[PDB]
Amino acid sequence: TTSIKHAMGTTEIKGKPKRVVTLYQGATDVAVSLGVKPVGAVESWTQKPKFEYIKNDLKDTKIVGQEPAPNLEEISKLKPDLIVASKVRNEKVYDQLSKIAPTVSTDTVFKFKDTTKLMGKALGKEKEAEDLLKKYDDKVAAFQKDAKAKYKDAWPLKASVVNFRADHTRIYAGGYAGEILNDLGFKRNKDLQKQVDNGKDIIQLTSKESIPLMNADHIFVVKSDPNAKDAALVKKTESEWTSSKEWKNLDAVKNNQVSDDLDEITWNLAGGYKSSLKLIDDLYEKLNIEKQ
Numbered sequence: 636t637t638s639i640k641h642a643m644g645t646t647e648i649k650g651k652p653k654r655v656v657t658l659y660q661g662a663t664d665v666a667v668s669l670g671v672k673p674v675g676a677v678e679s680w681t682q683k684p685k686f687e688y689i690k691n692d693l694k695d696t697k698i699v700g701q702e703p704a705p706n707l708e709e710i711s712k713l714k715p716d717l718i719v720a721s722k723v724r725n726e727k728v729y730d731q732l733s734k735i736a737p738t739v740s741t742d743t744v745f746k747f748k749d750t751t752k753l754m755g756k757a758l759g760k761e762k763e764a765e766d767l768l769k770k771y772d773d774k775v776a777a778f779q780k781d782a783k784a785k786y787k788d789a790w791p792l793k794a795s796v797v798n799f800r801a802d803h804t805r806i807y808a809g810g811y812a813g814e815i816l817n818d819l820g821f822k823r824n825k826d827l828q829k830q831v832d833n834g835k836d837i838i839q840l841t842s843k844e845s846i847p848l849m850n851a852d853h854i855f856v857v858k859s860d861p862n863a864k865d866a867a868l869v870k871k872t873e874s875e876w877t878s879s880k881e882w883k884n885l886d887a888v889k890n891n892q893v894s895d896d897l898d899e900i901t902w903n904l905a906g907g908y909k910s911s912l913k914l915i916d917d918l919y920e921k922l923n924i925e926k927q
Protein backbone atom coordinates (compact mmCIF):
# COMPACT_ATOMS: atom_id res chain seq x y z
CA THR A 636 0.00 0.00 0.00
CA THR A 637 1.23 3.48 -1.06
CA SER A 638 -0.46 6.84 -0.46
CA ILE A 639 0.19 9.51 -3.08
CA LYS A 640 -0.51 13.26 -2.87
CA HIS A 641 -1.17 14.63 -6.37
CA ALA A 642 -2.92 17.45 -8.22
CA MET A 643 -6.43 16.15 -7.60
CA GLY A 644 -6.12 14.93 -4.01
CA THR A 645 -4.86 11.80 -2.29
CA THR A 646 -4.86 8.29 -3.80
CA GLU A 647 -4.19 4.92 -2.15
CA ILE A 648 -2.50 2.38 -4.40
CA LYS A 649 -2.58 -1.24 -3.25
CA GLY A 650 0.35 -3.26 -4.62
CA LYS A 651 2.82 -2.61 -7.43
CA PRO A 652 0.52 -1.62 -10.30
CA LYS A 653 1.03 -3.73 -13.44
CA ARG A 654 -1.89 -2.57 -15.60
CA VAL A 655 -1.56 1.19 -16.12
CA VAL A 656 -3.69 3.43 -18.35
CA THR A 657 -2.08 6.71 -19.44
CA LEU A 658 -4.37 9.63 -20.32
CA TYR A 659 -1.90 12.06 -21.80
CA GLN A 660 0.92 11.68 -24.34
CA GLY A 661 3.76 12.37 -21.90
CA ALA A 662 2.42 9.88 -19.34
CA THR A 663 2.46 7.19 -22.05
CA ASP A 664 6.03 8.11 -22.88
CA VAL A 665 7.08 8.14 -19.23
CA ALA A 666 5.47 4.72 -18.59
CA VAL A 667 7.48 3.25 -21.47
CA SER A 668 10.64 5.04 -20.25
CA LEU A 669 10.15 3.48 -16.79
CA GLY A 670 9.83 -0.02 -18.37
CA VAL A 671 6.06 -0.31 -17.94
CA LYS A 672 4.00 -0.85 -21.13
CA PRO A 673 0.54 0.68 -20.54
CA VAL A 674 -2.44 -1.62 -21.04
CA GLY A 675 -4.32 1.42 -22.35
CA ALA A 676 -3.36 4.88 -23.68
CA VAL A 677 -4.97 7.87 -25.26
CA GLU A 678 -4.43 8.08 -29.03
CA SER A 679 -1.51 10.13 -30.33
CA TRP A 680 -2.28 13.63 -31.55
CA THR A 681 -0.87 12.88 -35.02
CA GLN A 682 0.32 9.63 -36.63
CA LYS A 683 -2.81 8.13 -35.06
CA PRO A 684 -3.28 5.93 -33.13
CA LYS A 685 0.34 5.69 -31.88
CA PHE A 686 3.35 7.89 -32.61
CA GLU A 687 5.92 6.15 -34.82
CA TYR A 688 8.73 6.68 -32.29
CA ILE A 689 6.89 4.68 -29.58
CA LYS A 690 4.40 2.36 -31.31
CA ASN A 691 6.69 -0.73 -31.13
CA ASP A 692 6.74 -0.27 -27.34
CA LEU A 693 2.92 -0.03 -27.35
CA LYS A 694 2.01 -3.18 -29.26
CA ASP A 695 -1.21 -4.56 -27.70
CA THR A 696 -1.75 -1.29 -25.80
CA LYS A 697 -5.44 -0.56 -26.26
CA ILE A 698 -6.47 2.93 -27.37
CA VAL A 699 -8.93 4.45 -24.92
CA GLY A 700 -9.91 7.48 -27.02
CA GLN A 701 -8.86 11.09 -27.61
CA GLU A 702 -6.87 13.01 -25.00
CA PRO A 703 -9.47 15.80 -24.61
CA ALA A 704 -12.18 13.22 -23.71
CA PRO A 705 -11.11 9.63 -23.14
CA ASN A 706 -13.69 6.84 -23.22
CA LEU A 707 -14.31 5.78 -19.62
CA GLU A 708 -15.99 2.52 -20.71
CA GLU A 709 -12.88 1.46 -22.61
CA ILE A 710 -10.69 2.34 -19.60
CA SER A 711 -12.99 0.29 -17.34
CA LYS A 712 -12.79 -2.75 -19.67
CA LEU A 713 -9.04 -2.90 -19.31
CA LYS A 714 -9.30 -3.53 -15.55
CA PRO A 715 -6.42 -1.16 -14.82
CA ASP A 716 -4.75 -0.97 -11.44
CA LEU A 717 -3.49 2.59 -12.05
CA ILE A 718 -4.74 5.49 -14.16
CA VAL A 719 -2.47 8.48 -14.83
CA ALA A 720 -4.55 11.61 -15.50
CA SER A 721 -4.06 15.39 -15.62
CA LYS A 722 -6.12 18.20 -14.10
CA VAL A 723 -6.03 20.03 -17.41
CA ARG A 724 -7.66 17.19 -19.39
CA ASN A 725 -9.55 15.21 -16.79
CA GLU A 726 -10.48 17.40 -13.80
CA LYS A 727 -14.22 16.99 -14.47
CA VAL A 728 -14.08 13.17 -14.70
CA TYR A 729 -11.50 12.56 -11.93
CA ASP A 730 -14.11 11.03 -9.57
CA GLN A 731 -15.34 8.76 -12.39
CA LEU A 732 -11.75 7.68 -13.10
CA SER A 733 -11.22 6.98 -9.37
CA LYS A 734 -14.27 4.67 -9.40
CA ILE A 735 -12.47 2.52 -11.97
CA ALA A 736 -8.99 2.39 -10.44
CA PRO A 737 -6.59 4.38 -8.24
CA THR A 738 -5.96 7.50 -10.28
CA VAL A 739 -3.05 9.92 -9.90
CA SER A 740 -2.92 13.34 -11.63
CA THR A 741 -0.34 16.02 -12.52
CA ASP A 742 -1.50 19.59 -13.04
CA THR A 743 -0.74 19.57 -16.77
CA VAL A 744 0.60 17.45 -19.57
CA PHE A 745 3.98 18.95 -20.46
CA LYS A 746 5.97 19.01 -17.18
CA PHE A 747 7.67 15.72 -17.97
CA LYS A 748 9.87 15.87 -14.84
CA ASP A 749 6.78 16.06 -12.64
CA THR A 750 5.15 13.24 -14.64
CA THR A 751 8.34 11.15 -14.20
CA LYS A 752 8.52 11.74 -10.43
CA LEU A 753 4.80 11.07 -9.90
CA MET A 754 4.80 7.94 -12.03
CA GLY A 755 8.03 6.76 -10.40
CA LYS A 756 6.25 6.85 -7.02
CA ALA A 757 2.97 5.38 -8.29
CA LEU A 758 4.66 2.50 -10.13
CA GLY A 759 7.29 1.68 -7.47
CA LYS A 760 9.95 2.76 -9.98
CA GLU A 761 11.46 5.60 -7.92
CA LYS A 762 15.08 4.59 -8.55
CA GLU A 763 14.38 4.26 -12.31
CA ALA A 764 12.73 7.73 -12.31
CA GLU A 765 15.67 9.25 -10.48
CA ASP A 766 18.13 7.73 -13.01
CA LEU A 767 16.07 9.08 -15.94
CA LEU A 768 16.04 12.59 -14.46
CA LYS A 769 19.78 12.43 -13.64
CA LYS A 770 20.41 11.54 -17.31
CA TYR A 771 18.36 14.55 -18.42
CA ASP A 772 20.12 16.88 -15.96
CA ASP A 773 23.49 15.66 -17.24
CA LYS A 774 22.47 16.34 -20.82
CA VAL A 775 21.24 19.81 -19.84
CA ALA A 776 24.52 20.60 -18.00
CA ALA A 777 26.55 19.47 -21.04
CA PHE A 778 24.41 21.54 -23.36
CA GLN A 779 24.96 24.69 -21.26
CA LYS A 780 28.74 24.07 -21.40
CA ASP A 781 28.75 23.57 -25.19
CA ALA A 782 26.48 26.58 -25.74
CA LYS A 783 28.71 28.86 -23.61
CA ALA A 784 31.76 27.57 -25.54
CA LYS A 785 30.18 28.48 -28.90
CA TYR A 786 28.44 31.74 -28.07
CA LYS A 787 30.87 33.09 -25.42
CA ASP A 788 29.91 36.69 -24.47
CA ALA A 789 26.63 36.32 -26.38
CA TRP A 790 25.49 33.50 -24.04
CA PRO A 791 22.74 33.33 -22.92
CA LEU A 792 20.73 33.79 -26.12
CA LYS A 793 17.10 34.80 -26.02
CA ALA A 794 14.83 32.20 -27.67
CA SER A 795 11.16 31.98 -28.62
CA VAL A 796 9.16 29.00 -29.84
CA VAL A 797 6.51 30.17 -32.33
CA ASN A 798 3.73 27.77 -33.36
CA PHE A 799 1.63 28.49 -36.41
CA ARG A 800 -1.87 26.97 -36.10
CA ALA A 801 -4.83 26.92 -38.48
CA ASP A 802 -6.48 30.15 -37.23
CA HIS A 803 -3.96 31.75 -34.82
CA THR A 804 -0.35 31.70 -33.70
CA ARG A 805 1.09 30.68 -30.32
CA ILE A 806 4.28 31.33 -28.39
CA TYR A 807 5.30 28.38 -26.20
CA ALA A 808 7.04 30.62 -23.65
CA GLY A 809 6.66 27.86 -21.13
CA GLY A 810 4.86 24.71 -22.12
CA TYR A 811 6.81 21.67 -23.25
CA ALA A 812 9.59 23.26 -25.34
CA GLY A 813 9.61 26.60 -23.50
CA GLU A 814 10.39 24.96 -20.17
CA ILE A 815 13.15 22.80 -21.69
CA LEU A 816 14.76 25.84 -23.33
CA ASN A 817 14.58 27.54 -19.92
CA ASP A 818 16.41 24.52 -18.39
CA LEU A 819 19.06 24.82 -21.11
CA GLY A 820 19.75 28.44 -20.11
CA PHE A 821 18.02 30.30 -22.93
CA LYS A 822 16.32 33.51 -21.82
CA ARG A 823 13.28 35.47 -23.03
CA ASN A 824 12.71 39.09 -24.07
CA LYS A 825 11.52 41.18 -21.15
CA ASP A 826 7.90 41.44 -22.27
CA LEU A 827 7.63 37.69 -22.90
CA GLN A 828 9.30 36.94 -19.55
CA LYS A 829 6.75 39.21 -17.86
CA GLN A 830 3.98 36.99 -19.34
CA VAL A 831 5.67 33.92 -17.90
CA ASP A 832 6.12 35.64 -14.52
CA ASN A 833 2.33 36.34 -14.61
CA GLY A 834 1.70 32.59 -14.89
CA LYS A 835 1.28 32.34 -18.66
CA ASP A 836 2.81 29.24 -20.32
CA ILE A 837 1.34 29.21 -23.84
CA ILE A 838 0.38 32.55 -25.36
CA GLN A 839 -2.32 32.59 -28.02
CA LEU A 840 -1.98 35.48 -30.43
CA THR A 841 -4.68 36.62 -32.78
CA SER A 842 -3.05 39.72 -34.30
CA LYS A 843 0.12 40.13 -36.37
CA GLU A 844 0.56 43.35 -34.39
CA SER A 845 1.63 41.07 -31.49
CA ILE A 846 4.56 39.62 -33.45
CA PRO A 847 7.09 41.75 -31.52
CA LEU A 848 6.36 39.63 -28.42
CA MET A 849 8.20 36.83 -30.28
CA ASN A 850 11.46 38.77 -30.44
CA ALA A 851 14.54 36.66 -29.72
CA ASP A 852 18.12 36.01 -30.89
CA HIS A 853 16.90 32.67 -32.29
CA ILE A 854 13.34 31.57 -33.14
CA PHE A 855 12.15 27.98 -33.36
CA VAL A 856 9.14 27.53 -35.62
CA VAL A 857 6.65 24.64 -35.14
CA LYS A 858 3.81 24.04 -37.61
CA SER A 859 1.21 22.13 -35.59
CA ASP A 860 -2.56 22.01 -35.19
CA PRO A 861 -3.57 18.37 -34.69
CA ASN A 862 -7.30 18.84 -34.68
CA ALA A 863 -7.54 21.24 -37.65
CA LYS A 864 -9.86 19.80 -40.30
CA ASP A 865 -7.72 21.27 -43.08
CA ALA A 866 -3.91 20.77 -42.81
CA ALA A 867 -3.26 23.47 -45.41
CA LEU A 868 -4.49 26.21 -43.06
CA VAL A 869 -1.37 25.97 -40.87
CA LYS A 870 0.76 26.74 -43.94
CA LYS A 871 -1.52 29.66 -44.84
CA THR A 872 -1.09 31.07 -41.32
CA GLU A 873 2.71 30.70 -41.51
CA SER A 874 2.70 32.35 -44.95
CA GLU A 875 0.63 35.36 -43.79
CA TRP A 876 2.49 35.89 -40.51
CA THR A 877 6.03 35.39 -41.89
CA SER A 878 5.20 37.77 -44.80
CA SER A 879 4.40 40.67 -42.44
CA LYS A 880 6.64 43.68 -41.83
CA GLU A 881 6.51 42.75 -38.12
CA TRP A 882 8.06 39.36 -38.74
CA LYS A 883 10.75 40.84 -40.97
CA ASN A 884 11.78 43.17 -38.14
CA LEU A 885 12.38 40.43 -35.57
CA ASP A 886 16.06 40.17 -34.56
CA ALA A 887 16.31 36.46 -35.31
CA VAL A 888 14.62 36.94 -38.72
CA LYS A 889 17.02 39.77 -39.71
CA ASN A 890 19.99 37.69 -38.62
CA ASN A 891 18.87 34.50 -40.38
CA GLN A 892 18.53 32.70 -37.03
CA VAL A 893 15.20 30.92 -37.54
CA SER A 894 14.88 27.13 -37.31
CA ASP A 895 12.00 26.15 -39.54
CA ASP A 896 10.17 22.83 -40.00
CA LEU A 897 10.91 21.37 -36.61
CA ASP A 898 9.26 18.04 -35.80
CA GLU A 899 6.03 18.86 -33.92
CA ILE A 900 6.18 15.48 -32.12
CA THR A 901 9.59 16.18 -30.58
CA TRP A 902 8.89 19.85 -29.99
CA ASN A 903 5.45 19.63 -28.42
CA LEU A 904 3.12 16.69 -28.99
CA ALA A 905 4.90 13.76 -27.38
CA GLY A 906 5.18 15.71 -24.13
CA GLY A 907 7.41 13.16 -22.50
CA TYR A 908 10.78 11.98 -21.29
CA LYS A 909 12.13 10.53 -24.53
CA SER A 910 11.43 13.71 -26.56
CA SER A 911 13.28 15.89 -24.04
CA LEU A 912 16.56 14.18 -24.92
CA LYS A 913 15.67 14.32 -28.61
CA LEU A 914 14.85 18.05 -28.45
CA ILE A 915 18.31 18.76 -26.95
CA ASP A 916 19.89 16.70 -29.78
CA ASP A 917 17.86 18.76 -32.28
CA LEU A 918 19.31 21.95 -30.79
CA TYR A 919 22.92 20.78 -31.28
CA GLU A 920 22.05 20.22 -34.95
CA LYS A 921 19.87 23.28 -35.66
CA LEU A 922 22.27 25.61 -33.81
CA ASN A 923 25.44 23.98 -35.18
CA ILE A 924 26.88 23.55 -31.67
CA GLU A 925 29.87 21.25 -31.23
CA LYS A 926 29.23 18.53 -28.64
CA GLN A 927 32.86 19.23 -27.65
Ligand SMILES: N[C@@H](CNC(=O)C[C@@](O)(CC(=O)NCCNC(=O)CCC(=O)C(=O)O)C(=O)O)C(=O)O
Pocket residue numbers: 680703723743744745810811837859860861862903904
Ligand atom coordinates in the same frame (compact mmCIF):
# COMPACT_ATOMS: atom_id res chain seq x y z
N1 LIG B 1 -4.82 22.04 -28.64
C1 LIG B 1 -5.62 20.85 -28.97
C2 LIG B 1 -4.77 19.78 -29.63
N2 LIG B 1 -3.60 19.42 -28.83
C3 LIG B 1 -2.42 19.99 -29.02
O1 LIG B 1 -2.17 20.77 -29.92
C4 LIG B 1 -1.34 19.65 -28.02
C5 LIG B 1 -1.46 20.52 -26.77
O2 LIG B 1 -2.80 20.44 -26.27
C6 LIG B 1 -0.44 20.00 -25.73
C7 LIG B 1 -0.27 20.90 -24.51
O3 LIG B 1 0.83 20.99 -23.98
N3 LIG B 1 -1.35 21.55 -24.06
C8 LIG B 1 -1.21 22.38 -22.88
C9 LIG B 1 -2.10 21.88 -21.76
N4 LIG B 1 -2.34 22.90 -20.75
C10 LIG B 1 -3.30 23.87 -20.85
O4 LIG B 1 -3.26 24.90 -20.21
C11 LIG B 1 -4.43 23.69 -21.82
C12 LIG B 1 -3.81 24.11 -23.13
C13 LIG B 1 -4.33 23.41 -24.35
O5 LIG B 1 -4.22 22.20 -24.54
C14 LIG B 1 -4.83 24.32 -25.37
O6 LIG B 1 -5.20 25.48 -25.05
O7 LIG B 1 -4.82 23.95 -26.54
C15 LIG B 1 -1.23 21.98 -27.13
O8 LIG B 1 -2.20 22.77 -27.18
O9 LIG B 1 -0.06 22.38 -27.35
C16 LIG B 1 -6.25 20.33 -27.71
O10 LIG B 1 -5.82 20.75 -26.62
O11 LIG B 1 -7.22 19.53 -27.81
Ligand SMILES: [Fe+3]
Pocket residue numbers: none
Ligand atom coordinates in the same frame (compact mmCIF):
# COMPACT_ATOMS: atom_id res chain seq x y z
FE1 LIG C 1 -4.06 21.94 -26.57
